Amino acid sequence: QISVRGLAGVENVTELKKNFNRHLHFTLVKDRNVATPRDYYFALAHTVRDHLVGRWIRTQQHYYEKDPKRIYYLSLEFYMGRTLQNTMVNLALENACDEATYQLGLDMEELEEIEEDAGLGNGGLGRLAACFLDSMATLGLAAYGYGIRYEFGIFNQKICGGWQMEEADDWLRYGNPWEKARPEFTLPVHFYGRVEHTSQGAKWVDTQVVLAMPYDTPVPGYRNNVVNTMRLWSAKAPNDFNLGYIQAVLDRNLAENISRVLYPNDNFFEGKELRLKQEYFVVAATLQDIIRRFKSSTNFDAFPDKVAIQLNDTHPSLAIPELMRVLVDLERLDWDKAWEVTVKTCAYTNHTVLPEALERWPVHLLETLLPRHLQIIYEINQRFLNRVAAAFPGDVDRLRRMSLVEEGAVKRINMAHLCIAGSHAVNGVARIHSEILKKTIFKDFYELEPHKFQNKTNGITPRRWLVLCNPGLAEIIAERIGEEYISDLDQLRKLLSYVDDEAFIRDVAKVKQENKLKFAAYLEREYKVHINPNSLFDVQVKRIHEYKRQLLNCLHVITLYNRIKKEPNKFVVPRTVMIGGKAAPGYHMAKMIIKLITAIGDVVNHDPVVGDRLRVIFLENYRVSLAEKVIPAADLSEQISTAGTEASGTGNMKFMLNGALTIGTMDGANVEMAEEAGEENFFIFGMRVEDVDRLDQRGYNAQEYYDRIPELRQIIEQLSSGFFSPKQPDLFKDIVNMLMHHDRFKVFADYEEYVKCQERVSALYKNPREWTRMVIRNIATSGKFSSDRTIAQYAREIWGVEPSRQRLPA
Amino acid sequence: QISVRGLAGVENVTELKKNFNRHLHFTLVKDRNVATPRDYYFALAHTVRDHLVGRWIRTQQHYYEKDPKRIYYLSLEFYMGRTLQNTMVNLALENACDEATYQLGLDMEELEEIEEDAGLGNGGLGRLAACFLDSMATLGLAAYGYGIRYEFGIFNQKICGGWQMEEADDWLRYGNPWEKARPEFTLPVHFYGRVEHTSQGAKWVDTQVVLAMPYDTPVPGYRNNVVNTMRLWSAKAPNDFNLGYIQAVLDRNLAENISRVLYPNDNFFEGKELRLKQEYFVVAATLQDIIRRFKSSTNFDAFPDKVAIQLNDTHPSLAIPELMRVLVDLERLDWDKAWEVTVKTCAYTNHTVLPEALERWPVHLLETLLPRHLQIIYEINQRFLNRVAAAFPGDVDRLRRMSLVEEGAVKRINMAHLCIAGSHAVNGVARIHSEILKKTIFKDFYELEPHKFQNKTNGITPRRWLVLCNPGLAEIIAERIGEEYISDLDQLRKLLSYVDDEAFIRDVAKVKQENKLKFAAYLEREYKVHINPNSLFDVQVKRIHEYKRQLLNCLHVITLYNRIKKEPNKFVVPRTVMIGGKAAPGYHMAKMIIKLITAIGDVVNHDPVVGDRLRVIFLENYRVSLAEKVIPAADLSEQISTAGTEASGTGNMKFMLNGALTIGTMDGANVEMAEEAGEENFFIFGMRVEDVDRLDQRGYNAQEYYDRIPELRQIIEQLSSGFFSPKQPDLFKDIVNMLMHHDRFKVFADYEEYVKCQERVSALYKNPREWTRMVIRNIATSGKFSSDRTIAQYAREIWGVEPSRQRLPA
Numbered sequence A, B: 001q002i003s004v005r006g007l008a009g010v011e012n013v014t015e016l017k018k019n020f021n022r023h024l025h026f027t028l029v030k031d032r033n034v035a036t037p038r039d040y041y042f043a044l045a046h047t048v049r050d051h052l053v054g055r056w057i058r059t060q061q062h063y064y065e066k067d068p069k070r071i072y073y074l075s076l077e078f079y080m081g082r083t084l085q086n087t088m089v090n091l092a093l094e095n096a097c098d099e100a101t102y103q104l105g106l107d108m109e110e111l112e113e114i115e116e117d118a119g120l121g122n123g124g125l126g127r128l129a130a131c132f133l134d135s136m137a138t139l140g141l142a143a144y145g146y147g148i149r150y151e152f153g154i155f156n157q158k159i160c161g162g163w164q165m166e167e168a169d170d171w172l173r174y175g176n177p178w179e180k181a182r183p184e185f186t187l188p189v190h191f192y193g194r195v196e197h198t199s200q201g202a203k204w205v206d207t208q209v210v211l212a213m214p215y216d217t218p219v220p221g222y223r224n225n226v227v228n229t230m231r232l233w234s235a236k237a238p239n240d241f242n243l244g245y246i247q248a249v250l251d252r253n254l255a256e257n258i259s260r261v262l263y264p265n266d267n268f269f270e271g272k273e274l275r276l277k278q279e280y281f282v283v284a285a286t287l288q289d290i291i292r293r294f295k296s297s298t299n300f301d302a303f304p305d306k307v308a309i310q311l312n313d314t315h316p317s318l319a320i321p322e323l324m325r326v327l328v329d330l331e332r333l334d335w336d337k338a339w340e341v342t343v344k345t346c347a348y349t350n351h352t353v354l355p356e357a358l359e360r361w362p363v364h365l366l367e368t369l370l371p372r373h374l375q376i377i378y379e380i381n382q383r384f385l386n387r388v389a390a391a392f393p394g395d396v397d398r399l400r401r402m403s404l405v406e407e408g409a410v411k412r413i414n415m416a417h418l419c420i421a422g423s424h425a426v427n428g429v430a431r432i433h434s435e436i437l438k439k440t441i442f443k444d445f446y447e448l449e450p451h452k453f454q455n456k457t458n459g460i461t462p463r464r465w466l467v468l469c470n471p472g473l474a475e476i477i478a479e480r481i482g483e484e485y486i487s488d489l490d491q492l493r494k495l496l497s498y499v500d501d502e503a504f505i506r507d508v509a510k511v512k513q514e515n516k517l518k519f520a521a522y523l524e525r526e527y528k529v530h531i532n533p534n535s536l537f538d539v540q541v542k543r544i545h546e547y548k549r550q551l552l553n554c555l556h557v558i559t560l561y562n563r564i565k566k567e568p569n570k571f572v573v574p575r576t577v578m579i580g581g582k583a584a585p586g587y588h589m590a591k592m593i594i595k596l597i598t599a600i601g602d603v604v605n606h607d608p609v610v611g612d613r614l615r616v617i618f619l620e621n622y623r624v625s626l627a628e629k630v631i632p633a634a635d636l637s638e639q640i641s642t643a644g645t646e647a648s649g650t651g652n653m654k655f656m657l658n659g660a661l662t663i664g665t666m667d668g669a670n671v672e673m674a675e676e677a678g679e680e681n682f683f684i685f686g687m688r689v690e691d692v693d694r695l696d697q698r699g700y701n702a703q704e705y706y707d708r709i710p711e712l713r714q715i716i717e718q719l720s721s722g723f724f725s726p727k728q729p730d731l732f733k734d735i736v737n738m739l740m741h742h743d744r745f746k747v748f749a750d751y752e753e754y755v756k757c758q759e760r761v762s763a764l765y766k767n768p769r770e771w772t773r774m775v776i777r778n779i780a781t782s783g784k785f786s787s788d789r790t791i792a793q794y795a796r797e798i799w800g801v802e803p804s805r806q807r808l809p810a
Ligand SMILES: OC[C@H]1O[C@@H](c2ncc(-c3ccccc3)[nH]2)[C@H](O)[C@@H](O)[C@@H]1O
Pocket: A122, A124, A125, A128, A265, A266, A267, A268, A269, A313, A351, A352, A357, A429, A458, A646, A647, A648, A649, A650, A668
C-alpha cells in the first residue's frame, strides 16, 4: 500500500503464508475452524519472530569474534509497549505481512490490537530506556539492556464513578512470544548474612541465596540486521530453600516476590525493603554476567576499555559498591586499583531534582540486608571526604553537605552522592536541567570535579514515534525527501523548503484530519463516547502529578466553560480537551485530581448551552499503545510544568514530531524545542526559572492572585461551594486548601499568562493555512530530538565508542 | 537395530534430521557451537512432538463428529514419568530417531536421560492412572484424564548421613514441551461464601473466586493414531483479586497456592484445608468442562448415555455433591431426577482398607469452605438412611454404621460412604480386596445394594513396562511369536511352548545378565557404588510403610549376615539386596526404617569376612525413571505385605513381566499372579488373611516369637544394644519397641516362614537352567496383568462402551 512499509514480493508473501499456517498447526495446535483472532495474532508473531533468529545469533557471534567495547544499560524500568509492529518495521516486513494476512482473509491491524503492552515502567524514564535500546541497535553498538522481568507491570487503570481503581497487569497470562528463557545461565544473588574479617580480607557469610534466571528479548536495529539483547532477571528460590514440608514449599514465594511487581511511583522515592531487594538483585546478577563475558575475552586494567556501565538514575547505584566488592573481596585487587577501574567504568544519569524523588536509604536497612556494601560505602565516603578536605581546607560545612552519609533522626545514605563519587561522568537530560544540577543540588560536586558534568538532551525514536504510529505522515514526508530521514532525522530540515507549497500544506492537514477521525472512531467503539472531529484536540497526557500541573489545565477548562455560560451566543473555537494519565496508588492528591477532571466533564459535557463547543474527556489507562493512537491525533500539546521541575519531558518531543503545536513553559527540553523551531512558532508562557526563584525569595502568597483576578476567584468559589460535586459539596476542599495555602508549584502565578496564551492558540486555529504552516516549521526542526542523536553523544562523549550505520550481512 | 523399534527409512530419517536442526535454530535459538546435551534433548522432543499434532487435532475432531460416550477419569495424581521414549514407541519412531540422531553425532540414550520425570503422584495409585490413560488411548476410547498441574511434584530424595532429606521437585524449571497451555478455556471456581434461600431455590453467594487454567498433554495410543488428552488445572488469581497496592498483588499467592504442591503421603489421609481446596478445585473446574462439552452435542436425561465419571478413590468425591449442585441449583432439575442422573454417571474405585487412609473430613471445614455442598451432603444422607430404614426396619445400629455423617468429638463426613451412595458401581482393585470390601468395611452397603459391587483387578501397560524399559526381552519374544502381543498380552501364553527350548532358555538368561550389567554400571557411574553382577539381585522397591514390611526384609538380611559370621567358610549364594523408596516427610517410623537400612549396609558392606557374598544397597530417589532401570535387572521381587493390607500392588506385576521370580504373601494381586503362573512357580509364604484374623482374635503377642526363635532374639538384642549404631546405641529403640509391643502388621509372625522360603529361593538360583525355566513360566502367564485387560473390563462392565483396536487414518 504505502512506500515506507517496504516491498510485498511474491516469494516473500508466499513464504510468510506457509509459515503462518505452520505455526497455527504445530505451535498453537489449532485448525482454522476453531481459531480465534488471538490465535491468529500468535501465529503472526511466531512467523515474524522466526525472521529475527538468524540475525540475533549472528549479531551475538559477531561481538564474540570482534570483541568490541560493550555497553551495559542498567535500569529498573523498560517501558517497551507492543513488539509486533516495531519488529516488522525494523525488518522491512510490514507490507509483506499485510499482504500475506490479507490473502488469508485477515486484517493485520486487528491482530496488532490483541498484543499486550510490555508495561515494565511508569512513564518517561522507562520509555527513555526503551527508545535508547532501539537507537543503540540502529547505531550498531554492542549494547545490552539489563533489568527485572516483573510478573506484573504498571497497573491497568479503570475509572469507576470518576475515581481511579487499579487492577493487576497480568501481561504474561497468554505467554510472551518475544522472550527466550535461559534457565541454563541462572546465577546466585546473596542477601542478609554478616561480614567476617580474616587474615586475607573480608568475607560475606551466612547469606540467604535467591537465584536470578535470565529471559532474553531481541532488540532489532532499523534495517541494519543488528539484533541486540535485553536481558531481564526473574527471581527463583533454590530447591533446598527452607528445606513442615508443605509450608517450606509454599514459603518459596518469599524469595520469588522480588520480581513480582513493578513499584508504580513516577518521580517519587518509596523507601521499602522490597524495592531495595529489587535494586540489588538486578545489580548483582548483571555484574556477574558482565564479568563472565569480560573474562571470556586476570588483568582488570583493561576492564574500562571493554566495559561501560550506564546507571539510569540512582536505582541501580549499588553497582558501584558491588563492583568494588567483587574486585576487592573476590578478585583480590587493592582498593585504589579497584576504585580506578570502577570510576572509569561507571557513569550516572540524573533524571530529577525533586527532593521527594531522590533516593536516601536508611542505614539500618542496608546494615541488615547488605552489610558488606554498607562497609564499602563508609570507606568510599571517608576517602572521598579526605579529598574534599584537601581541596577546600577548613570548609567544614562543605564536608557535611557532600557526605554520602546524611546525619539526622535516622542516618541515610544519599545515593546520588554515591553515584557522583563513583562515576567518571554525570549528566542531566536537558540543557536547563544540567545547568540546574551545577548551580544548585550538585554545586559542591561540580566545584570539586567540573570535568565530570555533562548534558545529554533526551530524545525519542522516530521508528516507533513516527513511522509506526503515523504512517500517513511518514509517507507524505518520504514522497518529498526520500526515506533516509528515518535514521537521520536532521534531514527533516529539508521540509522548510515546502512551507509555502500548497500541495504539501494540504497533505499535512489531511493527514491530521484522518488521524483525528480515526481516533474519534476509536473513542466511540471502545468507550461509547461521542466527540466532534472538527474541534481543536487539546491534549495533556502524562502521569498525574502536582508538578505537571494538570490542575492548571483544569482551571483553564473551567474558565472557558464560565465564559461560554456568560455569553452563550458568542462564537468560540470548539475544543475537545483530553487529559489522561495514571496516578500512583498511594498519591492521594493525584487521585483527587483525576476525580476533579471527571467531575468537570460531568458538568460540561451535559450542559445543553455548551453544545459541542467544549468537551472534556478523561482518557483511561494511558500507556504506550494509547500514546501511539492519541499523539498523532493531537492539535495542541500541553507541556505546562512549573519552570525548573520537569528535567526534560519526552512526550513533548513525540507531539512535535507528529504535527501538534505546543503550549508550554520554559522547562526541561521545551526550551531547546522552542530554540530549534523559533519562539514565534511555539506558544510560550509563564514564569521562567529565575522568576520562580524571585517569587520564593519574597514568598509565594496565593491569596494575592485570588484577590486580583475575578475569573480565578469565581472558579475557587465554584470548587469550594460544590458546583462540581452537588451531593458532596466539600469533596474538593483538599484541592482548594492546597491551592490557597501550600502550593509548591505556583498554579495561580501562571494562570493569567496561560489563559491569554490559550486565546492566541484559538486565534491561530481559526486560520487553518497559517496553523498548518506553523506545524510544518515544528516538524521540520524536530530532528535534534531523535534518540539517535542522543545515543551518538553518549557513545562519543561518555562511553568512548563510535557509532556505525553499516549493515551486517543478512 | 532391533525389530520392535520400527523402521528407519531414508526419507523419514532425512526429515527428522532437518526438523531437529530447524528446532535447534528457531525454537531453541542456539547453534551447534554452544549447544549442550540439554539443548539437544529439547530439539529432539520438539521434533517428536510435531508428529503428535496432526493426530491430536484429528482425534479430537473425530470425537466431536461421532459424539461417542466420553469417559472422564478424575484423579488427584497422574504419575507420568518421562514422555520422549514413550511417544516414539507409540508412534513407531524409535529406530528412525535413533538413526537420525546417530547421523548428527549424538547418542539418543544420553539425551533421554536429560528429561525430568513428570512426578505428579506418590506411587501406585498415581502410576495406575497413567497406565490407564495409555490403555484407554490404545483401546480407542474417547477418554480424558483430569487432574491438577502441581508446580512441585513428589519431592526429590537425598540421603544424608543415612537419613532421608527432601528437596523440592522443580520439574518445570526448563519448561515442559509436552503440555499446551490453554488460557482461553480458563474457568472460575468458588470457595467460602454463604447460602441464601430464595423463592426459587438456594443460591451460593459472596464467594471468593479462583481461576482454573487448563494445560493439555497428549496421550498417544499404541500405533493406532489415536491421541487423547490429559487436562491438568493450574490455579490463577483474578486480576481484581484483593483490589495497600503492593501487598494486594503479593497476596495473589494465597489463591495460587492451591496448585503449588502435591501432598506427599502414600496411603494416608492428612485432613488439611489446602488438600480439601485441591480436591474441590479439580472437581469444580472439571465438571464445568464436562457439562460444556455435553451441551455442545437442555435434556439431562441423556447425560449418563454421553458421560461416565470415574472417581480414583475418594479424593475427587466432591464430584457427587457438585454435580447435584449444578443440576439442582443452576439447571433447576428436581432433586430425584438430578440424583438419578448423578448415580448413573458416577462410579467409584476403592484402593485401600487401611483406616488411616480413609478420608473423613471434619464438618466444620466443609461448613466454612463449601457451605452449599455440606447442605447437599446432609440431604443425600437423610434420603439414603430413609432407604436403609425401609429395607432393614428397626436396625438402628445399621443406621448409625451406614450414615455419611460420623458422630463423635468432631463430626466428620465419611467420603467412602458418600461415594457408594452416589455411584452405580463400586469396585476394588484385586479379587481378594474386592472380597474384603464386601465382607468387612462395606458389608452393610453390599447387603443393601449387592449389584453395585464389582472387582477390576489392576494391570500395567506393557508399552512402558516391557517394550520401553526392556527392549532386549521384547525382541527375543517377538522373534518367536511376532509383535502382536504388545497390544494383546495374553499371546505371551505361546511362550509355554518354549520352556524346553535350549536356545530360548539361553536368550532369556542372557537378556537378564545384560540388564544386570547395565544396572551395575549405572550404579558405579552415578553413585560410585560397586556391586557383583553375578549375585542374585534381590529387590524391594516401593514406598516405605509399616504395612509393606521393609522391616521383615531387614530381619532377613541381618539373619543372612549373622549366619555368615557364624560359619564364614561355608558357601552361600551371593546376594545384592536392594531396597528403595520414599518416606512421607511426616512419617517418623518410615524415616527410621530408611536409617536402619542404611545402618545395616554400613556394617555389612564393610565386613571383610562377608566379602562380596552379601551387599545391602539403599536405592536413592526411587521414581518411575529408576523403576524402568532396576526392574529389568531384578532376579527376585519382594512382595511381602501383611495379608489383607496391599489392595493390589502393581510393582509386583512389573517384575513378573520382566523376568523376576516373586517371593510374596497371599495379598492383593499376588494371589491372582500365583494362580496364573501356578503355585509351584511362585515363592509363597506366610499367613493368609484368615490366619491374620485368627491371630487378632486370640491376640498378637510378639514376645512369644522372641522367646521361641533364637535367631530372632539375637537380632533384637543387636538392634537394642547398638550393634548397628555404635555412637548412638539407643538409636533404634522406637523400632524395637514397636516390634515388641505394638506391631499392627505382625512382622515376627511371618519371620520363620519367610526365612525358610528365602532358603528355597537360594537353592533354585544354584541351578540356572531351572531358575530360568520357572522365569519363562512367569513371563508366559503375565498376560492377565495388562491394563488393556483391566480397561476393557471397566469399559464393558462399568462405562457401557466397547473398546476398539481399529486404526484412525494418519
Ligand atoms: O529522563 C526521562 C524522564 O525521567 C523522568 C523521571 N525522573 C525520575 C523518574 C523516576 C523516579 C523514581 C521512580 C520512577 C521514575 N522519572 C523525568 O520526570 C522526566 O522529565 C524525564 O523526561
